[PDB]
Point group: D2
Amino acid sequence: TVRSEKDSMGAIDVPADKLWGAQTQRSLEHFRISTEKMPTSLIHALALTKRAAAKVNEDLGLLSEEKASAIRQAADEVLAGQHDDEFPLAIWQTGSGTQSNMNMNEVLANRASELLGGVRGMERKVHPNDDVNKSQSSNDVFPTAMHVAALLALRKQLIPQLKTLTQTLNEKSRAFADIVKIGRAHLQDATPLTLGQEISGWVAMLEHNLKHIEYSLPHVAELALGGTAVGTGLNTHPEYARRVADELAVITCAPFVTAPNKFEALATCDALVQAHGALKGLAASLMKIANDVRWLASGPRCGIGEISIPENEPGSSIMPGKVNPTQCEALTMLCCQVMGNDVAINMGGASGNFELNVFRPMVIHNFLQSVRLLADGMESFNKHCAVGIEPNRERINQLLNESLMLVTALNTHIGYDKAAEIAKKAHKEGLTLKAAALALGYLSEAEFDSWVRPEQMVG
Amino acid sequence: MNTVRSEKDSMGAIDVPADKLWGAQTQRSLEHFRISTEKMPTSLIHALALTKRAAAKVNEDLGLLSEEKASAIRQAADEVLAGQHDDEFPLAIWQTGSGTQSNMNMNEVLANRASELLGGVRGMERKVHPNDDVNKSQSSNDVFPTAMHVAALLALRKQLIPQLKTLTQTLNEKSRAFADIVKIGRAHLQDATPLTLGQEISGWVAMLEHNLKHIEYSLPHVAELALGGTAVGTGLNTHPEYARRVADELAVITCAPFVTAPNKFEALATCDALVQAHGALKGLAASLMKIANDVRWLASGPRCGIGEISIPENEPGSSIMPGKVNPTQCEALTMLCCQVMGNDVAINMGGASGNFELNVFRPMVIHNFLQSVRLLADGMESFNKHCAVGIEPNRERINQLLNESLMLVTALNTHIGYDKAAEIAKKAHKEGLTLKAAALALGYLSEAEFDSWVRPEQMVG
Amino acid sequence: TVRSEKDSMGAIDVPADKLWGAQTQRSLEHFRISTEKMPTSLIHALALTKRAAAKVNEDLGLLSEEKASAIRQAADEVLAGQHDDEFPLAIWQTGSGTQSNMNMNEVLANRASELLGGVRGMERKVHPNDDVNKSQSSNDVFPTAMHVAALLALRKQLIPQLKTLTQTLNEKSRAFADIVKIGRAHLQDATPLTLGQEISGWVAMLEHNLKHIEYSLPHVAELALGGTAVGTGLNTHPEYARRVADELAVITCAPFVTAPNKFEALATCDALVQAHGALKGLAASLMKIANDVRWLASGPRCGIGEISIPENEPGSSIMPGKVNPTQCEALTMLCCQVMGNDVAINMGGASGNFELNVFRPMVIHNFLQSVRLLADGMESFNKHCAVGIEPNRERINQLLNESLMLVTALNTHIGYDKAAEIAKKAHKEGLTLKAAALALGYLSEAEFDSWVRPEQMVG
Amino acid sequence: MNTVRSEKDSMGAIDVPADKLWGAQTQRSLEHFRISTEKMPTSLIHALALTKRAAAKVNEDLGLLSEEKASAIRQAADEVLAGQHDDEFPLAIWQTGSGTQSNMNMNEVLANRASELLGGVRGMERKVHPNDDVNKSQSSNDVFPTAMHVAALLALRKQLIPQLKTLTQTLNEKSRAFADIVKIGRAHLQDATPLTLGQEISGWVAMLEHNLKHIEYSLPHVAELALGGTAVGTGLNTHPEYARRVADELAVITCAPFVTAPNKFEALATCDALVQAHGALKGLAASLMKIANDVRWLASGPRCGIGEISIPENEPGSSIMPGKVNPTQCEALTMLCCQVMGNDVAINMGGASGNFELNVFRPMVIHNFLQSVRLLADGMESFNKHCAVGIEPNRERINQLLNESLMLVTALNTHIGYDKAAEIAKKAHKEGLTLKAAALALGYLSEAEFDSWVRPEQMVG
């Protein structure tokens, strides 16, 4: 049920049905903290990093073809979801990510050995440090995997969902471009605008956020691999750093480059501090959009009620028409999460010392969580709420025409004094503007209808 | 004034303005830390003056300082406390992280002024000396944290807690006045089963009562003073009774329960008491944010919002816009609540960043802490007098919303059964009717029965 | 492989081998956001809440004995770890926690039905809403479970580990009470103190933190259950709120009480905002302690090196004596996490509206994570680092006696001018204080040894 | 001055100090928002004056305002910009959340002063009118966000970016000067394989270069101006060319690339551009924190720390304490970096909290944003001139640490093999020896061979 594996500290029992080795087993004794583990995106990015390193080491004559090919095959099995239970280590580990680096080295070595006709364990044909970790340090591998996971997640998950939600809201803005509604400023009734114009503000917000996120991508694409222990690249081939970045770009189809300054790359998490700045911007914009949606949908009788949203959860037959804005609640909650995650990242990023930042597992745990939250939240809000936003046209018109805000349309036809007198009488006596104007005898019903045109007050 | 006076320290001579009372170390700090515009607040300047006044009294008691000098230093400190020397403290928050430079600012100003009070002059011929006399038995390392806690505890006791109690009393009065006014509930922003306006306000009251207890729990730790720890916490170069005596003297002159810190290493190496006390303040900020938001949403209108309450109108409006009242006190309060949340993060980072024997993030920590206390105290004072005391219900609007809602339908269940009550509610929702109109249209009851049976005052417990 | 369950929205297929029902299945369609789920502590607290509600409903004659007993048995199975895979829902759900409330209602009803000789599904003998949710709302159940989980986690995990770490450091402080070392202020050499005194500062910090955490417990012990939908308790028995709090106190052995104001209890997360304030205080104290440990252990040759710590991970045979402070790295990282979690909690807690705060899943996700991180982090730091702290006595003495800081011991024997002259000569020429004093002929070697006593300079 | 002047608004009459230029709405705000001590910063006051100067010019171009009045308003605004009226702006940050009251403060001061410039008087007989003339074509809702972006973009362009470039140049000079000085590496705080001091400093340089690019990426969005959106974004009651014309005029007079916001609803309902730009500033704060910490740790000593570099000594020391230099510039800089992190949270909360057509957290957002810019700009300026320009290596100490370390042992591998090199390192560690002493004791090489083979200058790439 167990096998005996060894490292420089001695022998330790490892579960026979697992592919990790002595160092991963020791880490399970020493970092038993909470429940957060490396996310799949990061495990995959680590496997890609090892796949690329093995290819380059083979190209340079440093690693045999049979070993490099077997390591790549084992890495491909990880990427294909065959080894999810082989990565048991906590986020809350050595701050360089050494323990997860060695977790990947051991799993890939033991599995590659089997692919070459050997066994897992100390009789293995492929070796975690001498083969799988060749030319590498934990110090440069972990930040490489951080940036690979971050850039691919932004490109493949977050940006597509942002574009999809933007397109939905742009369609709604055009569909509702002629629906005049009351403005609200300071929460008070205000000058009118169209529902389409209000939604166009949400659209422009998401378009601006996309640009800010795109501006953060070039720095995240810079990779530390090749800096080795402290940034000098001591005892590596002069072409290794460029070659491994090129190979990662090939296999991922993304524009990875080697970091021009390896000391900045090892000593900081600056690219991720900056990129997460754009994500907390998106979180503040999504919070505002989600709040507008839920407030505009509030009711069905004692709130605003200008729009309806899809009803996705069962309700009580004695409470028909009550629709809780549950997608808005999930989205506003995760937006608060992103703001907190930004603080954790900022503290970690501010806390490097000398040649190495050792707050890395926590930084990437927060960053990749924010990406999942924002991408999946935008997907869910789009599919289950935004695509179904519809106006309540009678309620919109009732609020608009019963308000006091259209009174300025009378200024050019009668006095400002008379228009103001009409509004004051309406407010004091609970009348519409039309009823107050007729009672004062300042105009005809025909004149009011001709002169007070909300569709001429939105430009 | 253009004319200068030459002042000296261990580094040499430097020119200071002839009409000012500070000395060489203040002038160097003024010239070397030209960073932004934030300076020590008056509360902290006063706390430093109190600390020097107490230290002079105890040094005299112990035979270490002459009566002549001790009395003159106390007189100079009382002038600072009386507001006569605000322009003598020009230094930035963004200075040395121990607050050494502001300690020396007080030492120099008090020495030069005490010299004049003894018939002498300011400058290098002074009769009283900043380090040998005004800083006797002290270090910057233990003086600045002492002044931090003196300023913090007095601000909490004399400004924040009284204003919190006052706002709580006002809202308790409103809760009692409106105890019989039934209104629609709102959960998830959706219409919900009713409660009274008094019950809703009682929630705000209970929040403020809980916050007071949390703030009170933080006061004993802030009352612990570092003075007597000297440079690294061991008390080297102090009389064995000095730490206790100076805490006692500060307690006498401030009428606050200051005590010497039982562990001077914790007192010098951390800002932990302020990290914890500010945790209670960010709790109060979250509660005030919610209360302020309820007030402004409930007052929203005049015709396209909720409009269940009115608030006092303090700012001019437009003649052509009767009935519009911007909730400006609510806006100031929600803004400062956000400020307190950010200040908490700055404090937490400074508090987490001590090294070995000394935390050197102190000016920044106290700048944020005292700002949060001013904002919460003055914000509650302003919100109370300019909004809370004048909150009133709009009774007709409250009843209109309640009677137009679908949420009173369960009052029918005991009379006609669940199935028919649900049928009425569904018809009312689908057809845009009141519950009464839907019930009459189906023939399930009369108007008199509806009015007899549907009683909101029986639906609030 | 599936069964058909029903709610008010219609029929939906549910996996036959699962115990949840229609509403939980719908939630899996609508809240597919990230990977964070309710933690075990919260699932258990929900089960305890349902167990207590069923007991009280039976006492009041509202629920049959056979149904109440079967519900309690099913809840006990959850608490015993038999149903961990029956709670699949995301944190990022309806902000009142309705979906997780219904998850518990459905699992307990389907399982209780089996315990009464029935089946799971629509033929069940026990009903999720009419039986398991009797006398309750999601609005008051979820905050009750939040406070039950929070108070029990603070009492059973965090406070014991805090006391254990404090005891270890108190023992180290006493053991090292006579070891004089150089002080450090502003990172510069400073007046001496003992290693025991320095550690006593850490101890006093942890003692103060325990008091602050204890002060937060009475508010967390207040429970919302009995306030029902909006706080009025409409259509509940007048004794129900007190009875359910009493029953929770009995079964958990903790001092739960009914909240004296149910409107504060439903409309806010104030108790948890305040309690988390004390946890971020602990995080700032632990950050400082962990940093002192790793800096004091830094080296082995080019840092401070005044203490040694246990070596828990393998190293390279060509780098003997290098010991990375990996427990300090895990602890400082999780302390940053707690600071970020506090911001997320503060935003959620500030964001209630009217009768209900609907940021609750996110608030409790953060709060319970901080408790796990701090409790497990203190356990790990204690077991794997603090218990093994030892002084490097020769290095401590070398730094102390080669510094310039002991010079003030000469002030009372010779001039201050002469002592200052000795220190300046030592600094300019790279000498010890003793060598400089002898070169100036200001004292004998015997006088220096008699007069310069570090053990007399620490009080 | 005790004597008053009666000023009027729509609400009635109120007394203002006779020697002041503001009017009734400023006086009401001053009296109703007595909250703490933070006021509008001078940069924002100047941006509001620039906005009114540009609006007057365009209104005159469009035939909407007489040449007489437009020229007088521009003259009054230029007086504000020249620093002649700082005491005419007394209002708190903690005011109405749209900044209406500070908009009116500028309208009233400029109208009363422009009246005097036309031969008239201040007060109700004035020749120029705050709302009809100075606020013509404008709303508070679009003026205050415009002034926010004008102040923010000019502060970034004229203060922050130049100081960032200057500090970067200094550190690049140091990196080149020290390119040949090999020192011990430190990873996890543990001794590590070597690098040059120039290489280590090149990391700081590269950080500051990256930060400059990130800040530059944020400038186009801040350059978008809300002016012309009026009350809710539709531009009702403006000439169709007004929004473009006023952005063009602001671009001319400031020499900065201001443009009208393509979507006025986004411009009025959010502070998104400032949320994003402040994200780049908190990035810079994290980088500066790391650089400042490296400097102070590397300079720590004089005898019980690292001590690889020296820094300028700017503050007096104790005669009895030669060689001790507190890193006070590093302490001021690390403190303000914490402040920027907290300010970011306050900004994020305000930015997330817009409702419908208007974000009303604006005074708080701009107070934090402009503070962060002052702190980072002035902090970099101060750190550069008072610390960075004078950083020097301690060459003997650098070499002592390098030669006493165990981390040069791999230079032996090619000569004697891994096994013997590892044996030497283990013996040196266990017995407290240098690598050379351990190698000689085992008889594995001579002293001349060790000196020939162990070359740190060959171990840095």
